[PDB]
């Protein structure tokens, strides 16, 4: 879907203030604690048996950064998300066997993390623009499953 001129401005403004080395790791960690079955995809990362273990794991933090960088590329090609994510969609389907419902859950955890970091600045209006972005990314990652 199309973002309006105002929605685009709000997204660009907040994203320039994000802690690039921090936000992605917290989002991936909360996915693994809140929705505990997601731990199975990351078995090679180590001990994930309690909330404290997941949130202290170095491999979880590093991969979270790579995920954030991918969101950042998406933000520069909002009218061609399918072409941008075509290769990654093939990977998550054909090789990793991730059910697409999990793409939606990760998007919403990211939104909860932006809320925790920005407080009063994460207004209903800023949240609304980000919901359009995370939905667009989820759909683009799912497109080669069909």
């Amino acid at each position: 879907v199309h973002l309006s001129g105002e929605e685009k401005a709000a997204v660009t403004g907040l994203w320039g203030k994000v802690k690039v080395d921090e936000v992605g790791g917290e989002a991936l960690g909360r996915l693994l604690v809140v929705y505990p079955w997601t731990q199975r995809f990351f078995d090679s990362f180590g001990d994930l048996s309690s909330a404290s273990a997941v949130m202290g794991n170095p491999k979880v933090k590093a991969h979270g950064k790579k995920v954030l960088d991918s969101f950042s590329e998406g933000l520069q090609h909002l009218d061609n998300l399918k072409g941008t994510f075509a290769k990654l969609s093939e990977l998550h389907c054909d090789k990793l066997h991730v059910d697409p419902e999990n793409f939606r859950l990760l998007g919403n955890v990211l939104v909860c993390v932006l809320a925790r970091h920005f407080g009063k600045e994460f207004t209903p209006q800023v949240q609304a623009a980000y919901q359009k972005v995370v939905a667009g990314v989820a759909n683009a990652l799912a497109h080669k499953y069909h």
């Binding site: 960690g29 909360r30 604690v33 809140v34 909330a51 997941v54 949130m55 919403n108 939104v111 909860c112 809320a115 925790r116 970091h117 407080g119 009063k120 994460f122 209903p124 209006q125 949240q127 609304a128 919901q131």
Partner: protein
């Protein structure tokens, strides 16, 4: 399904909410209406502008209902029998909408209580809201 540990976590979060349950209820509703415009269709009889009196009053009702659930957390079907009658038999609300409101409640709590909203507490709260949601969309007269 909710553990003894989950019950302790939910009660801890609610202690920190203090006297603010009504304010948080109203904010969660406002976030839902703007982000997800289709949810507005369940309230055609409301003025849905920011800071409306109708949204303030309703936010207080939703909040107070959640406080009763916490106080009777050992038997949710027993405590919520009347509210289930309303949401399941009369209003016929699609379960997708309960996911949207629950998410908006989590976003609100995260915004206001950044030091109390730990990953472990986030997990117990998501479970509690899912259990409440299931009771409210089930028919059990």
């Amino acid at each position: 399904v909710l553990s003894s540990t989950d019950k302790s976590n939910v009660k801890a979060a609610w202690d920190k909410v203090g006297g603010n349950v009504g304010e948080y209820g109203a904010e969660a509703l406002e976030r839902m209406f703007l982000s997800f415009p289709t949810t507005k269709t369940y309230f055609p009889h409301f003025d849905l502008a920011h800071g409306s009196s109708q949204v303030k009053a309703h936010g207080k009702k939703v909040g107070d209902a959640l406080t009763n659930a916490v106080g009777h957390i050992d038997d949710l079907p027993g405590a919520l029998s009347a509210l289930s009658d309303l949401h399941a038999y009369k209003l016929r609300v699609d379960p997708v909408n309960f996911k949207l409101l629950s998410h908006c409640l989590l976003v609100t709590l995260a915004s206001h209580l950044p030091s109390d909203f730990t990953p472990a507490v986030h997990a117990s709260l998501d479970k509690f809201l899912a259990s409440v949601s299931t009771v409210l969309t089930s028919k059990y007269r």
